[PDB]
Amino acid sequence: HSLSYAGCNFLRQRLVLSTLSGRPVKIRKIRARDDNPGLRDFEASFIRLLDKITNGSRIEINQTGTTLYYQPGLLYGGSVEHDCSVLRGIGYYLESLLCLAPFMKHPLKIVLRGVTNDQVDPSVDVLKATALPLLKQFGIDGESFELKIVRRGMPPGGGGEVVFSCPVRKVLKPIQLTDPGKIKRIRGMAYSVRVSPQMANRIVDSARSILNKFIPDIYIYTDHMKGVNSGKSPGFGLSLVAETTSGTFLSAELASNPQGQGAAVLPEDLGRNCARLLLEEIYRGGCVDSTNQSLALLLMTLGQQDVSKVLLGPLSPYTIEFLRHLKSFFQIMFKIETKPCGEELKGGDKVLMTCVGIGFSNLSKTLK
Amino acid sequence: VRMARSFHRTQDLKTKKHHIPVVDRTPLEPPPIVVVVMGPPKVGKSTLIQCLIRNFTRQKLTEIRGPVTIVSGKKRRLTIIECGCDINMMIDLAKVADLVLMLIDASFGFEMETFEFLNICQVHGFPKIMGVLTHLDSFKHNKQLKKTKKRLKHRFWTEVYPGAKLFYLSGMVHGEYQNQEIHNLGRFITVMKFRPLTWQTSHPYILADRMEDLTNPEDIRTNIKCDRKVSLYGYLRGAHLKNKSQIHMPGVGDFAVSDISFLPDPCALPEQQKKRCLNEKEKLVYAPLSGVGGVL
Amino acid sequence: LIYGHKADSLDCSRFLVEAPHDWDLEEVMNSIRDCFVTESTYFDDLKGEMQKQAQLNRAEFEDQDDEARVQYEGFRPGMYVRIEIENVPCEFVQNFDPHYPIILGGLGNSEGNVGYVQMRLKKHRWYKKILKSRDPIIFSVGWRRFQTIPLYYIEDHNGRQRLLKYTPQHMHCGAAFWGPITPQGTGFLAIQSVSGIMPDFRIAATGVVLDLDKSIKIVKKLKLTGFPYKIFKNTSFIKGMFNSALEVAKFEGAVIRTVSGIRGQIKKALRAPEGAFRASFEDKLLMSDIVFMRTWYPVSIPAFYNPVTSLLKPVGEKDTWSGMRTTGQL
Amino acid sequence: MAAAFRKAAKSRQREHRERSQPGFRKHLGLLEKKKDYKLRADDYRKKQEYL
Amino acid sequence: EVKSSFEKRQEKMNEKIASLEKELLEKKPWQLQGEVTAQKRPENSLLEETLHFDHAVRMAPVITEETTLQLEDIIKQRIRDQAW
Amino acid sequence: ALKANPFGGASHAKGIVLEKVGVEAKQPNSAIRKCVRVQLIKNGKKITAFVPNDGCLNFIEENDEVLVAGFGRKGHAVGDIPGVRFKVVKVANVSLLALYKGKKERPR
Amino acid sequence: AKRAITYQIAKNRGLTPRRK
RNA sequence: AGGGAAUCAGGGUUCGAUUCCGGAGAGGGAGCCUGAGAAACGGCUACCACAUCCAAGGAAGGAGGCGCGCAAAUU
RNA sequence: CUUUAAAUCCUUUAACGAGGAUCCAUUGGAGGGCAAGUCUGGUGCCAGCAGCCGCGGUAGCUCCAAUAGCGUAUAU
Ligand SMILES: Nc1nc2c(ncn2[C@@H]2O[C@H](COP(=O)(O)OP(=O)(O)OP(=O)(O)O)[C@@H](O)[C@H]2O)c(=O)[nH]1
Ligand SMILES: [Mg+2]
Ligand SMILES: [Mg+2]
After folding, report:
1. D10 lies within 8 A of chain G by CB
2. Helices B112-124 and B87-96 meet at what angle, rounded to 10?
3. What DSSP assignment string belongs to A111-177?
4. Is the CB of G8 under 7 A from strand I?
5. With 0-12 CB in 10 A as exposed, 13-18 as middle and 19+ as buried, what is C139?
6. For residue B85, which atom of ligand 1 is closest to its CA?
7. String of b and e for B195-215 (b: at least 16 CB within 10 Å)?
8. E20, E41, E52 ranked by CB distance to C304: nearest
9. Sign of dihedral through CA atoms B58, B61, B62, B68?
10. Is the C-alpha dihedral spanning C177, C180, C185, C191 positive or negative?
């Protein structure tokens, strides 16, 4: 029994849920009412990434490219080398791999080549800082669990390289994350490639200017890569991370405009805007950040038939649609209960998400 | 030195207690326990089934077919099924059985079917097993009877865990086993406890009590060979079940469940009261394919 | 809202701010003010965690009604339930027998699919015959009972899986076949014939399921044989291994050895006969010696899966079910 | 009880058997094995060292 | 007469079983047989067989422009340091 | 010094089979090959235990429950390897000798 | 029509070393 | 203050045998009825505490097994 | 038969019941034997580990100690 969908939006989650459930999916009318009707190259690059990291898959593409049929195979790990398209960031592909990493047959050792930092897609600095501790909460922690950035990349040239390694686990542990905690420290990363090193420092004194009143402890790292490590295009940006007592992480990031289009951004404005964006996240703060809401829900459904609870902020349109696909594929329905928090003066209202997992195990892992 | 000896003995006691910690997924209200009766073809399986039923309900049952659910105690119910000598039946019941009663002919001795079923049980998850040996009336209460009991008991202890009980049925008074032996046998079933098996815990399963064909009658007249819609009633066991799922029925094939709905429980446990014994109202027999009283 | 244009849009997992706060007034800053800082053994701790989870599972949905509870956690064990099944074969209803039990087994994820299953297998100690590879056999796995054609192989220390002709008399053995997906760690049982009665023990073999994959990777040993015809001390001229000069060029430098155990190397092709070549050796050869080279050839298994349909039989012949016959019966 | 494990393994005493020359090459002579080659190999090595 | 849905599947299974039973009694092809000489196998058969075998010795290195440049880089370095 | 020993004053201990480190390495020594890693349930410590004979590894799988006893004497019998202080006696409360000789079948 | 057990199953000697 | 105390009998050293008690209570404290002998090993009344049947009005009552994969002489 | 309230048990006693007498004693310790077989390392032909698995085929070796008994682990 194969599911049918229409459109190109939400393409990644439809493919990721299909290979985990094992049920084929049909996609129709991709960018039909457009000058270019067929698939975009970055979507085709994503499909090629799935083919290498699985075994036994069958994929059908129309000559027009308007429809797609995907028959999932078993997940096979090992060493993989991929060249990501420069139109979308590496973090665009890295989210899907983070969902599929623990259920491979062999531990995944993949090196990704493309663009690391971008405005459209989340930065790999954010995923390293925030997404990886969340998987460690589920018990996927290991000595080989790491993200390492070999060289940075900025559009349009790109030229960045990251390596990802994750252990394999038979079953996922349940979690009960109901206390968000209180924010102790703020950590940040300032980077500049193919430009003067002064750009990094001009971002630091603006972000610190706003955030020093709330917290005494803020320290921002500065990174400057030279030579081939710099990439092929100039740019600069800032990523900010806030740590709580309970161990949760909240993040925000911004990047400068590409060389080809857009006016140059003042480094002081970038530092001020990124700090204000982080404060917006704190007003919306929960146990997980807004980007990682969909990742947290997926790992909860794959538990060993136990009740799990998470406290997260306002629901994103991405996560609301993700919840609908979870009911379509895995037939799970969460119980939703909002928290008023009217007089505690934490900020905006929070939503408590609870569910019971479906019986799921790693079928690809080899018993010896 | 006595304290050191006491210290060492406590550690050995702790060692036996150790096992893998696991979340207890047993239901708050358990379903009726599945009890299977098997043996060689003419050992007395069906005669034993009537004796256990008469021990608990006083309700008359004739033409016993399929599973029979009875109330045996304040907090326990039993589903009793007979296992034929056909090998296909032996394989399916071992997957679903919670308690196994094996019948052994003491006069003839051990047979092939007794050992085959033990190998089946070891493969698919070993349930609680109690062996009952009959036909002891052929012996003359002498050295031969005493030695035959010991010979069969030691061989029986190799297949199963040591300490597993063997029950003795001396003889029949009027074609029924003695009431004291049956009552003692029923006491052992009541107080037994069960471990969680791996396959049964992970997968939901149902032993169907009633079947009903739900098709348009005119479709059968048009074509007898048409595919038919079938409704099934039974107790849910093992794990939770979703609305739209794939189920395998052994001997037929794979199917997908269209509609699911719960029903008020028949043969239900009593509301708690401190009466010494259950009256005739509380003792219930549910057997839709067997025929209760006089009606079949 | 959740459970009660947008297409052709960007796949971005970002929460854009519809209405950002000023962050310059003190009242806005005040809203987020509180968010900032102003002897038991290892076995006992594990046991404590399980009890807390056990209490949490039972005491989660007790408030909601049963109809509400079904949507969130499904039908719990201990409920009397009614199941409606469609597309049942007609022979089930007409040939129904109340004595034969009916069991409904819930399937997990991907268990409806088919694939390659690698198993650890040992022939049963009380079975008289042994199992030959590439002969039909019925497996009792999970909920299913089906007949397939398996391959028996043995593991080597380097990791190679080489094909075996027969099941070994006293050892475990790898088994691979094409069939339904089944979770790891489960036991399985082997029979030769469900129909008919046999005086001897009927259980053929027993083991556990190990692996699931889409490729078998099983290989078989293949030897190409040649004979010397001209000898010059170490160097000898070999014929019979190949039949063309193209064949020799593909296998130059291959390690070859004699039955006597002298190791050699293929050096260069010879023109005067069609497929001869020149080979050097450790020591001088005799005319009676036979040379061969060791090669590995991948094998394949047919995809044949025949489930047992004993209930789809008339009432008198449910015991008599037959399928594909083995080599001896043919 | 390591010796007990070895004794159980050596319960069967059938050993692997030797294969003979093929029939169509019988006039050539006996198919030599490692034990046969070692006799002529050591004989040649003995003479060369003396020379 | 009319044929049942289960009976239709049985007919397809029976054809498949018959084909498989033919293969068992048939003579095995030369690839599956061990210890095969050139006479039994057809001409030029191994070219498409894709067998696996081991090589006795390392192949001789191939000279290219890249190896020339790296070697000249080594020579130039010794010249600068007078590392004779 | 009542609790001095690694077994906490007991003569035997129970553990969970983590991996067969000897099998994963491709060395055919048959002394490395019979080394397995288990984690004691009582205290969570990880030790390396010895399987009496090659081919009893086939009976053991990962995540199984085994009984481990001390290795008091005859340590020098194994070929030039340190750390021979533990040995696997039972799996699933069944002795390895009974499984090897074909006197009992492992219950699942 | 009764399938009695063999001598091997009755006495599970198994792999026992042979003695004179 | 389970333990004793005694007793009889006996060739190859006794793996002998038996007997004797300090009282009290009958769901909990009081009151009461008979007989030679009891403030009863048994009835009753009031109070306190439990629990069963019902047509809802009313009526009747006074010890041991497991927790060691293990409950038959509890006959 | 006798026994006993009745029966069982003990003691008597009629008839069958052995050549591979297969009507087949075990536990622990130490050795021998092997192929067109596999792996690893080298000192060309070697060594270690090990060997019911080989091209095709599926219709029950020896010695030592105790003996209806005999080992292992921890503490001593
Ligand atoms: N003498 C004696 N006969 C017994 C005993 N137990 C069962 N039987 C015989 O078993 C017969 C009854 O057979 P069933 O009740 O049908 O038992 P079954 O094993 O289910 O036989 P099937 O129904 O054919 O499977 C009786 O007539 C008895 O002769 C016993 O303990 N002693
Ligand atoms: Mg019957
Ligand atoms: Mg004689």
Report:
1. yes
2. 40
3. EEEE----SSS--HHHIIIIIHHHHHHTT---TT-EEEEEE--BTTTB-EEEEEEE---SSBPP-EE
4. no
5. buried
6. 25
7. eebebbbbbbbbbbbbbeeee
8. E20
9. negative
10. negative
Resolution (A): 3.6
Q: Which amino acid appears at position A85 of this protein?
A: S
Scan for tokens 């004739």, then name that residue. B62
CB A58 within 8 A of CB A71: yes
The C-alpha R_g of chain B, in whole angstroms, comes to 22
User: Of A160, A156, A159, A158, whose CA–CA distance to A260 is shortest?
Assistant: A156
In this complex, the answer to whether residue C155 has its CB under 7 A from any atom of chain I, a nucleic strand, is no
Contact F67, F90 (CB under 8 A): yes
F98 CA, I65 C1': separation in Å? 24
H/E run at residue F66: strand F65-70
β-pair partners for C228: C238
Q: Cβ contact (<8 Å) for E24 and C135? A: yes
Residues 132-171 of A with CB under 8 A from C: none
* Probe residue for ligand 1, chosen from B47, B51, B64 as the CB with the greatest number of ligand atoms within 8 Å: B47
Pick the atom of ligand 1 nearest to B177's CA. Answer: 31
Of A33, A27, A29, nearest to A14 by C-alpha is A27
Task: Give the residue among D24, E20, D16, E50 at the shortest CA–CA distance from C222.
Answer: E50
Nucleotide nearest to B180 (CA to C1'): H75
In this structure, the residue with its CA closest to atom 9 of ligand 1 is B44
Q: Are B189 and B72 in contact (CB under 8 A)?
A: yes
CA of G11 to the centre of ligand 3 (A): 29
Q: Which amino acid is at B145?
A: L
Residues in chain A: 368
Largest CA distance in chain C: 104
How many other C-beta atoms lie within 10 A of the C-beta of residue B35?
22
**Residue B163 CB in 7 A reach of strand H:** yes
CB within 8 Å of A102: residues ≥ 6 apart: A135, A140, A166, A167, A168, A169, A172, A362
**Residue F75: DSSP 8-state:** G
Strand partners, A114: A160
Sequence letter at residue C82: R
Residue type, A171: V
Confirm if C137 and C131 have CB atoms less than 8 A apart. yes
Residue C64, CA distances (Å) to C59, C69, C71 in order: 11, 6, 10
How close is the nearest chain B Cα to the Cα of F52, in Å? 22
Structural tokens at position C291 = 């040379």
Q: Are the Cβ atoms of B256 and A1 closer than 8 angstroms?
A: yes
Q: What phi and psi values does residue C28 have, to the nearest 5 degrees?
A: -65, -45
For residue C50, the chain A residues in CB contact (below 8 A) are none
